Amino acid sequence: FASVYAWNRKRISNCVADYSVLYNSASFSTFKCYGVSPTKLNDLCFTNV
Amino acid sequence: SSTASALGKLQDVVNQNAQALNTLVKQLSSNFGAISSVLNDILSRLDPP
């Protein structure tokens, strides 16, 4: 990865994102989300990420 | 038949009623400090607490 003063920013669009497979993994120490419930991340279609 | 503006009272009453109803309907679309003005979105995006 990069440093904190040169953080990489990338765009995600025109793709089929699967969040259930990302969420169910226990390798993530902390996963806290604001404004959207993670369980309901699979029924929402967005504009840009 | 010719001269207009002789029926100000009735038109004024109708205008008052229509304007009150219109502003009542328009008040529905305000945000009131929440995150969205439509209830179907907020129910389908957040968690009950």
Residue A12 is which amino acid? Answer: I
Tell me which method was used to determine the 3D structure. cryo-EM
* Residue indicated by tokens 């009272």: B9
Assess contact for A48 and A15: CB atoms under 8 A. no
Residue type, A21: V
Q: Which residues of A touch B46 (CB under 8 A)?
A: 35-37
- Chain CA centroid to CA A28, Å: 12
For tokens 């679309």, name the residue. Answer: B29
CB atoms A36 and B35 under 8 Å:
no
* Token duo for residue A38: 């993670």
Show the 3-state SS of chain A: CCCCCCCCCCCCCCCCCCCHHHHHCCCCCCCCCCCCCHHHHCCCCCCCC
Final resolution, Å: 3.6
Asked whether the beta carbons of residue A37 and residue B47 sit closer than 8 angstroms, the reply is yes
Residue length of chain A: 49
For residue B12, the number of C-alpha atoms closer than 13 Å in the C-beta half-sphere is 5
C-beta separation of A27 from A4 below 8 A: no
> Read out DSSP for chain B?
-------HHHHHHHHHHHHHHHHHHHGGG--TTSS-S-HHHHHTTS---
